[PDB]
């Protein structure tokens, strides 16, 4: 009864239903998400008010399925799932040192080496007939980049290594999804989460032994995760952030690459423009320097437009503590507010011809979306990995565009699925040819 007065109803995802309801019932709508009543707020005035203030914190109840799944601690109180401002701020300021401009410049060698490994694997299959799952290959690439860049470890998923780890990630993602929506599935999810935390324990002990033996350890994300727990009572906070960064640092990047390859397979004119830009900026060069990234201006526009239609992370929640009038609607206190870049990106009120893929929306002369577009969120709880992700994805896409042509296999769909994140429904099965052919 406390929400009954709020407007709302008497390869698709629940986000599409929410879009239909936002269009029909307006900027403040009652919905059920993760088994809880919430209110989706889709005005840019509400996005600005609630996301750009430290007054409004995340609603912990809407992060329970990241904290713990089926009684197994997962992300716990790591950087994503910690909803107490002062406990979040302490870890954020320490882990931020690993995402400095200087830190990220030093990662270009890892980005380039894993992107080059992926394109050599794909060029050997580029016979115009062998079907290749681009969603699988891009996920292996993202995992190998993350493991190396963040932890100094070689997963070698591009070589077919670490299949139990790959299985553990997939079952954990299925567990998050099932928790927010029997005996075998419980056992498999629970053992997968323990496996991932045990990977953390093993790799933290490997790093600690290296430091005690006096070996060279390059400062990385893991250095700062350890620094954040200096003098803590135990290792549970460290393993929360290990698992947080192990998962968050590859899954959305993979999803974003797969969506971009999927959408570009039906945009031959935009591909011909991207191929021309990479030819002009990097030419024959095997290696992209940091200064080359800023020169790939049309690619950066294409990747922004991909995130507008296909955001892997569709949004965020804030807790409304006190009854508040939002856009002419009385919203009771202690209510989770849902913000969706997926919903707002598909509203004609905010984007003209919203289903058209048009990179010129992000062109230099174009008016910037004002609080209608937030694939990395906004304000103090925005993605810490945003610049890491934009660099690694531009490196991978630039090297694909330099070397290969992709055709989506007929019958492959453009629809979405929601696990923990949004990603293509289908494997993005393509045939490949070398450029020139
Ligand atoms: C295209 C890629 C990515 C997208 C679309 C994305 C999106 C987002 C979004 C929407 C949030 C806000 C989540 C919330 O409010 O609950 C967020 C937070 C976060 N992301 Fe990402 N992310 C990406 C890549 C990364 C990468 C590469 C890393 C790590 C290396 C990462 C680590 C995190 C962390 C730790 C947070 C929590 C930040 C905090 O609250 O202080 N993400 N991301
Ligand atoms: C499990 C998982 C896989 N990838 N990520 C991810 C990657 C990078 N940056 C943010 C991410 N998450 C997306 C889920 C999102 C969530 O569950 N909310 C809002 C309730 C929180 C932020 C989390």
Curated annotation (Swiss-Prot):
GO terms for molecular function: cholesterol 24-hydroxylase activity; heme binding; iron ion binding; steroid hydroxylase activity; testosterone 16-beta-hydroxylase activity; testosterone 6-beta-hydroxylase activity. Gene3D superfamilies: Cytochrome P450 (1.10.630.10). PANTHER family: CHOLESTEROL 24-HYDROXYLASE, CYTOCHROME P450 FAMILY 46 SUBFAMILY A. It is a single-pass membrane protein. Its cofactor is heme. This is Cholesterol 24-hydroxylase. GO terms for cellular component: dendrite; endoplasmic reticulum; endoplasmic reticulum membrane; postsynapse; presynapse. It catalyses: cholesterol + reduced [NADPH--hemoprotein reductase] + O2 = (24S)-hydroxycholesterol + oxidized [NADPH--hemoprotein reductase] + H2O + H(+); cholestanol + reduced [NADPH--hemoprotein reductase] + O2 = (24S)-hydroxycholestanol + oxidized [NADPH--hemoprotein reductase] + H2O + H(+); 7-dehydrocholesterol + reduced [NADPH--hemoprotein reductase] + O2 = cholesta-5,7-dien-3beta,24S-diol + oxidized [NADPH--hemoprotein reductase] + H2O + H(+); 7-dehydrocholesterol + reduced [NADPH--hemoprotein reductase] + O2 = cholesta-5,7-dien-3beta,25-diol + oxidized [NADPH--hemoprotein reductase] + H2O + H(+). The gene is CYP46A1.
